Every structure is written in structure tokens, then in C-alpha cells.
């Protein structure tokens, strides 16, 4: 079997639906005149354009059939997160979005699994929604990797992860709200430079802060896009830890020894990069994920893993066995 655990959806939100939350900043879906194409919209401005797989579960199942994908795990498009909104409205939005998600999966719940969003700007509302959404059928949570200047080392975010650990709630960490300022204006550089750095920063924030010494081993947490540049730059981190006490202040063993505390997806778009990723993380900690249905995703889902020279046993773990245990999928 084949599980793709990194994909996105966007719900059929109407303009008036979104305006009952925020006419200016709540996103909504316009399935335009040709109907094949949408804008995610913000207010009446256009946000970015999308196509039908994002919103149509029937159309998506036929593509999954064609790709040979048996089970796809899907979650919010990050524009849905609403982390800057007033907390109570953000909690109402998260519940609505997560209900939308379960309705998406209800067309074929054996083949479409969903993860939930949470109002991460209020720790109490976010823990309550994580528990509520998983009890209603979600298999885990997808969060952005940072909340403004608060990275994953911040006690509020560590506490959210620890809540999920203690309740057996898996987490997918997705880069969002990219660093860079007024640079990287062209050629989608935020997706090529800032996004892998954001994910590396999230992983290193947990490691170098000592958070894994405090978060229970029960935490199942995965980072998108192969963990960004984390695995390649890990030697540089270990060398810094060895030679500067301020890099060691909160992290009692070499940073690379914490790779047994998290997972990555396999979306690194290159055979050598995947071999290095599996070398660093272990065949038990890399899961097939495509970023379907976005253009910077993998067109032939699983093609990189399937055409690799990894062991047949490792190929099965990455394509199916790891996600099956991580998300409890049969």
C-alpha cells in the first residue's frame, strides 16, 4: 500500500461565510468562470490561484487512483491558519475549518485522512481544539513552525507539543510566514530559501533549547519538506556545539543524537538528498509526502522513493509502514 502524508485542501468557503469572521483577512474560495480554477481570495483581493484537486474530494480520489496513492493525509493550506487574529474568533475559525476537513474526508474516510488546525495564539484554546478535533476523527494536528518571533523553543509552543504528546496526538510542523523581509521578491525564493530555513530553525529550536529533554518521548512530530536543510547542515551544528559553550548551554548531548525524537517527510526532490536524509534520520523516521496538489510538490507521487536504491524494506517503511504507525492508519 501507499500513504502520502503531506498534502493540502482548501474548503468551499463563500465570500459571505468568510466575512462573518473577517471581511478583510479571512480567506475564501472562488471557483471561477471556467470552474477548473480558483483563487483563494482575501476580502475581494485575489490571494493566489489554485486548481480543483485542492477543493474537490471526488476529483482528488480519481487522481489518487491514477497515482497509485491508497491513503492520503491532508490538512489546511497555511493561509487558513489565522494566527494573527483575535484568539476567540481564531478558535471559532479553527473549529469551522476542522469540521470542513472532516466533511472533505467523509466522501471516503478509509482513503482520505485529515489533520487539524489550532488557534495557536492562545495555548488553552489550541489544546482544547487539538483534543476536540482528534476526538471527532482527525489523526493529528498541523501547525505552522513559528508564531511571529516565538519559535518552537518558546514555552507556549513547547507546552502545546507536550499536550499533544501526553494525549497521543501526532503533529505535522509546516513552514509558514517566512523570514526574509523585503528580500526574495522574485523567482519564488521564499519557497526555495526561506521555507527550508524556517523548518531547520524549528527543528534546531527544539534541539538546542533542550526541549526534547522535557517533552515526553511519546511525542510523534514530523517536519515537512524533509526537515528543510536540517540533515545537510547537521554536521555544522554539531561542530558549533562542540566549540562554543553558548551553543551547549541548554542542550546536554550532541545535537545529532536527537534525530530519534522526530520524523521528516521524504520531499527532497533528489536521489542523493534522499539517501543523505535516510542516512541521518534512519529508514524508520522518513515518510512519503508529496505536497499535493501544489506545483512545488512531487508530480509522480512516490517516484523518488520508488526509483531509489534504498532497500526494499526501507522503501516499504517510507511509502507505507512509517505513516501507518505514526498516524495509526490501517
Question: Which residues in this chain contact a second copy in the complex, by CB under 8 A?
Answer: 146, 149, 151, 153, 179-184, 186-189, 191-194, 196-197, 200-201, 204-205, 208-209, 225, 229, 231-240, 243-244, 246-247, 249-251, 268-270, 272-273, 276, 279-280, 295-296, 298-299
Q: 3-state DSSP call for residue 39?
A: strand
Nearer to a second copy (CB atom), residue 145 or residue 162: 145
Alpha-carbon span 91 to 122, nearest angstrom? 9
Residue 315 · residue 278 · CB < 8 Å? no
Q: Least Å distance between CB 267 and a second copy?
A: 8
In the complex, minimum distance from the CB of residue 49 to Zn ion, in angstroms, rounded to a whole number: 17
Distances (CA, A) of 78 to 44, 167, 224: 19, 24, 13
Do residues 148 and 168 lie in contact, with contact meaning Cβ atoms separated by under 8 Å? Answer: no
State in angstroms the smallest separation of the CB of 322 from Zn ion: 18
Neighbours of 246 (CB within 10 A): 9
CA triple 218-219-225, angle to 5 deg:
140
- Between 158 and 265, CB nearer to Zn ion: 265
| 8 assigned binding-site residue | yes
- Residue 174 counted as an annotated binding residue: yes
Binding residues with Zn ion: total (CB under 5 A):
1
Q: Are strands 45-51 and 37-42 parallel, antiparallel or unpaired?
A: antiparallel
Question: Whole-number minimum distance, CB 297 to Zn ion, in Å?
Answer: 7
Among 68, 97, 69, CA closest to 82: 97
DSSP three-state, residue 263? strand
Whether residue 146 is annotated as binding a ligand: the answer is no
Closest residue to Zn ion in the complex (CB): 291
Which residue is it, cell 514555552?
155
Q: Is 291 in the site for Zn ion (CB under 5 A)?
A: yes
Shortest Cβ 20–a second copy spacing (Å): 34
- Per the DSSP assignment, residues forming a β-bridge with 147 are 150
Say which entry of Zn ion, a second copy, none residue 231 contacts (CB below 5 to 8 A, set by partner kind).
Answer: a second copy
Q: Quote the cell numbers at residue 181.
A: 523581509
**Which CB atom, from 14 or from 279, has the smaller least distance to a second copy?**
279
- Positions at the binding site: 6, 8, 174, 291
- Positions at the binding site for Zn(2+): 6, 8, 174, 291
Binding site for Zn ion (CB under 5 A): 291
Amino acid at each position: 500500500p501507499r500513504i502520502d502524508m503531506h498534502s493540502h485542501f482548501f474548503p468551499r468557503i463563500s465570500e459571505q461565510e468568510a466575512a462573518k469572521f473577517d471581511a478583510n483577512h479571512a480567506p475564501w474560495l472562488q471557483v471561477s468562470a471556467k470552474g477548473d480554477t480558483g483563487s483563494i481570495m482575501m476580502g475581494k483581493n485575489n490571494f493566489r490561484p489554485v486548481y480543483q484537486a485542492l477543493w474537490d474530494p471526488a476529483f482528488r480520489i480519481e487522481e489518487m487512483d491514477a497515482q497509485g496513492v491508497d491513503v492520503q493525509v491532508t490538512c489546511a493550506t497555511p493561509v487558513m491558519f489565522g494566527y494573527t487574529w483575535e484568539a476567540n474568533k481564531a478558535a471559532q475559525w479553527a473549529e469551522r475549518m476542522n469540521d470542513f476537513a472532516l466533511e472533505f474526508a467523509a466522501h471516503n474516510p478509509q482513503r482520505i485522512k485529515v489533520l487539524a488546525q489550532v488557534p495557536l495564539q492562545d495555548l488553552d484554546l489550541a489544546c482544547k481544539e487539538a483534543s476536540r478535533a482528534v476526538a471527532a476523527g482527525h489523526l493529528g494536528i498541523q501547525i505552522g513552525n513559528h508564531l511571529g518571533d516565538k519559535d518552537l523553543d518558546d514555552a507556549t509552543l513547547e507546552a502545546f507539543l507536550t499536550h499533544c504528546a501526553n494525549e497521543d496526538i501526532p503533529i505535522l510542523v509546516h513552514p509558514w510566514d517566512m523570514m526574509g523581509g523585503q528580500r526574495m521578491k522574485k523567482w519564488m525564493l521564499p519557497w526555495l530559501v526561506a521555507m527550508p530555513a524556517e523548518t531547520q530553525l524549528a527543528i534546531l529550536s527544539l534541539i538546542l533549547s533542550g526541549a526534547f529533554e522535557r517533552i515526553p518521548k511519546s511525542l510523534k512530530i514530523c517536519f515537512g519538506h524533509g526537515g528543510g536543510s536540517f540533515a545537510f547542515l547537521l554536521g555544522r551544528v554539531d561542530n558549533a556545539w562542540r566549540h562554543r559553550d553558548i551553543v551547549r548551554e541548554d542542550c546536554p548531548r550532541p545535537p545529532s543524537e536527537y534525530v530519534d525524537r522526530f520524523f521528516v517527510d521524504s520531499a527532497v526532490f533528489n536521489p542523493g538528498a534522499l539517501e543523505l536524509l535516510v542516512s541521518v534520520m534512519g529508514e524508520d523516521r522518513v515518510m512519503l509526502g508529496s505536497d499535493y496538489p501544489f506545483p512545488l510538490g512531487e508530480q509522480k507521487i512516490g517516484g523518488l522513493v520508488l526509483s531509489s536504491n534504498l532497500g526494499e524494506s526501507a522503501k516499504d517503511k517510507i511509502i507505507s509502514g512509517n505513516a501507518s504507525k505514526f498516524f495509526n492508519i490501517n
